[PDB]
Paper text:
Cyclic GMP–AMP synthase (cGAS) is a cytosolic DNA sensor that produces the second messenger cG[2′–5′]pA[3′–5′]p (2′3′-cGAMP) and controls activation of innate immunity in mammalian cells. Here we show that cGAS-like receptors (cGLRs) are innate immune sensors that are capable of recognizing divergent molecular patterns and catalysing synthesis of distinct nucleotide second messenger signals. In support of this conclusion, Hartmann, Imler, Cai and colleagues have identified cGLR2 as a second functional cGLR in Drosophila and have demonstrated in vivo that cGLR1 and cGLR2 have discrete roles in Drosophila immunity. Together, our results define cGLRs as receptors in animal cells that are capable of detecting diverse pathogen-associated molecular patterns and dictating response to the foreign environment.
To define the function of cGAS-like enzymes in animals, we screened predicted cGAS homologues for suitability in structural analysis and determined a 2.4 Å crystal structure of the human protein MB21D2 (hMB21D2; encoded by C3orf59) and a 1.6 Å crystal structure of a protein from the beetle species Tribolium castaneum (GenBank XP_969398.1). Despite divergence in the primary sequence, the hMB21D2 and T. castaneum XP_969398.1 structures each reveal close homology to human cGAS with a shared bi-lobed architecture, a caged nucleotidyltransferase core, a Gly-[Gly/Ser] activation loop and a putative catalytic triad. A conserved groove is present in both the hMB21D2 and the T. castaneum XP_969398.1 structures, but is notably distinguished by the absence of a Zn-ribbon and the insertion of a C-terminal α-helix in hMB21D2. In contrast to hMB21D2, the surface of T. castaneum XP_969398.1 shares highly conserved basic residues with human cGAS and we therefore tested this enzyme with candidate DNA and RNA ligands. We observed that T. castaneum XP_969398.1 is activated to synthesize a nucleotide product upon recognition of double-stranded RNA (dsRNA).
Author numbering: 3 to 229, 232 to 391
Write the structure that this text describes.
Amino acid sequence: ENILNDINKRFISLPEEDVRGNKQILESVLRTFVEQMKTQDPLFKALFRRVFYGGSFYDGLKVGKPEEFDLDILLHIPIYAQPVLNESNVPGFVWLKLNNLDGWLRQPEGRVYKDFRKKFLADNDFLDTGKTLRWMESLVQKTLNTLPWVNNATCELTNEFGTFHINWWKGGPAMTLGISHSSGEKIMDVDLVACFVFSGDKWPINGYRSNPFPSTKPEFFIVPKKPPVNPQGRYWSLSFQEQERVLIDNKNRLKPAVKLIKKLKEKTHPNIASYYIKTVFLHIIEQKDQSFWNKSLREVFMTTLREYNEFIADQSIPYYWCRKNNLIGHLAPITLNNISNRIGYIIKDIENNPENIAKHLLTKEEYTKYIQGEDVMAEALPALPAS
Ligand SMILES: [Mn+2]
């Protein structure tokens, strides 16, 4: 009863000591950068509340060597300006307008918000995703220029863990910081995502699931990821990732089971996004008694794999927070039929033969190292590099 845990340790999960050490380094580099950002823009300093570290690495759900995560930079509009969040005509997306920005500007603390409308708002004082992204990109560029550069446009930052190199580029809506040890070893990429955070009173009700932790996780935020829709720039995504992280925590077999299924997905059906698997497990959490997660890893894996296949076969994975959004509604029936048939064959092949699981989860090259006793995760990303 250790086959699945052994596969996970040797071929799936970064050792937790290295997870923790890389997080301490990365979080310190980013605090230095965000503190410098505050020196470059009083409006950013006024808006800034906190950061949220987003992605599978920080959820404990990353398969293999971690490569990137999102720095969700949470900005807060003063409630005196009367922000109003409305559920949009596209399930899962919202609009945000301000009903009293002028009254806030007439307050003493509103002085630093003199350019907020110009920088962030479209017609009728709607928060605009494109304007927000352009504002953050400009601020990041301004900040990068004030840092010491070595080599060719490589920033050098120091902290209690040593000296680090920051490279940057824009491959999407948000700037990416590539963070490396000064000795050359790459650590991780970080996307700098400008978000707006709200208190529990603003939680959407029209077609949305209620907050499971309104006392201890009261806040949620909106993310400038658009769904063609009109009006352009008004549609914001909701992030309930802070609540999702609590839902998946303290559940023993759950995170190994998710990663085993994600490993299977990477090998046999990359057509399915990782968040769709995460979403299936949110539904399973809601359906199952809490004791389910204390069963054997084999039983949790086999049972959730079967239920995952039923979602795929049904061709519907409802967005956990707004059920009218089918996360796989855009995938073709033929594709989903083939993937469900694939998974059904795998279930039959491993049903009564747990020694066949590794044959389906691992590439042939990984399987050879598996049989030979190798551990490819032990040194996948040492927080203290060998140099
Ligand atoms: Mn339940």
